[PDB]
Amino acid sequence: PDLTDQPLPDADHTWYTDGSSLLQRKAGAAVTTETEVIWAKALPAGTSAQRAELIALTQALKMAEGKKLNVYTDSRYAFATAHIHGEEIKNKDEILALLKALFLPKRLSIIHCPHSAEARGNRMADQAARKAAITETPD
Amino acid sequence: IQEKKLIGRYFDEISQDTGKYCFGVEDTLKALEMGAVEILIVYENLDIMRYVLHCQGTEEEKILYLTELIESMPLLEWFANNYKKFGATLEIVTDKSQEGSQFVKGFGGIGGILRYRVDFQ
């Protein structure tokens, strides 16, 4: 309940998450900066894009324990869900995970994104997610 | 009074994973033009301005939302006057409630309940 949708001015990290589910059905998740991949995994057998997106976000939050984080998702679902903390339900597994992860950072901004930093960072994250998915066989 | 019933309803579309919601200026506009917004929820002190701008050499016209000039107006006022053309009922709200506060702090003070699921690809 310190959680804003617009950037913190004083942030140590500005991270960009993605989690595609691919055509061909393959699933990657990733966390990056504007220019460098931090964390990337392929996900269990053909899992949904919503589950990958949340995983990628829960994981950004985990790794930002005690830091000041701006993080960008492209997922309306992952952004919306995270912002309505204050509450049969689908992706329960991944949502509880996300709900506890929220409390780890010292400052948190979870921002939505559709050659500026935002465009490049989102791009970077989708590349790495869509590349840990294709060129990699799950666990 | 029932600010909280509507935003609660809005939040439930998220929480129930319906996909029948939108937020922010771009998704909401885009959704409005597909005939997809049933209720349009807007923060009463919404800060966004709608600028109508001229394109240099041309006698053409370009609109712009921000936070040579032809006409300027608050998007809220623009919504109030023009929302019925997407139909689309309109609910202006405030942040003096907890539901309304989260809407503004977390969803940018602008969003909608949707008739059907939209992509935003």
Author numbering:
A (entry chain A): 507 to 530, 534 to 596, 610 to 636, 642 to 666
B (entry chain B): 281 to 347, 367 to 420
Give sentences from the paper.
To verify this interaction, we also determined the crystal structure of the isolated RNase H domain of MoMLV RT in complex with eRF1-C at a resolution of 2.8 Å. As the RNase H/eRF1-C interface is identical with that observed in the MoMLV RT/eRF1 complex, subsequent analysis concerning the RT–eRF1 interaction only refers to the RNase H/eRF1-C structure. The interaction of the RNase H domain of MoMLV RT with eRF1-C buries a total solvent accessible surface area of 1173 Å2. The RNase H domain mainly uses its helix α2 to interact with eRF1-C through predominantly hydrophobic contacts. Residues Phe588, Ala589, Ile593 and the methylene group of Arg585 in helix α2 of the RNase H domain form a hydrophobic patch that interacts with the hydrophobic residues of eRF1-C, including Phe291 and Ile294 in helix α8, Tyr301 and Phe303 in the loop region connecting α8-α9 and Phe406 in loop α11-β11 (numbering as previously described). In addition to these predominant hydrophobic interactions, Arg585 of the RNase H domain forms a salt bridge with Asp307 of eRF1-C, Gln559 of RNase H is hydrogen bonded to Asp297 of eRF1-C, and Asp511 of RNase H forms hydrogen bonds with the carbonyl groups of Lys404 and Gly407 in helix α11 of eRF1-C. Mutation of Ile294, Tyr301 or Phe406 of eRF1-C to alanine disrupted its interaction with RNase H. Likewise, single mutations in the isolated RNase H domain (R585A, F588A and A589K) of MoMLV RT abolished its binding to eRF1-C. Mutation of Arg585 to Ala would abolish its salt bridge interaction with Asp307, while substitution of Ala589 by a lysine would place a charged residue inside the hydrophobic interface, thereby destabilizing the RNase H/eRF1-C interaction. WT RNase H binds to eRF1 with an equilibrium dissociation constant (Kd) of ∼4.18 μM. The RNase H mutant F588A showed ∼10-fold reduced binding to eRF1, whereas the binding of R585A or A589K to eRF1 was abrogated. These data indicate that helix α2 of the RNase H domain in MoMLV RT harbouring these residues is critical for the RT–eRF1 interaction.
Previously, we showed that MoMLV utilized its RT to interact with host eRF1, thereby promoting stop codon read-through to make Gag–Pol19. In eukaryotes, stop codon recognition is initiated by the binding of the essential termination factor eRF1 in complex with a guanosine triphosphate (GTP)-bound eRF3 to the ribosome. Our structure shows that the MoMLV RT interacts with the C-terminal domain of eRF1 via its RNase H domain. Structure-guided functional assays suggest that MoMLV RT suppresses translation termination by outcompeting eRF3 for binding to eRF1.
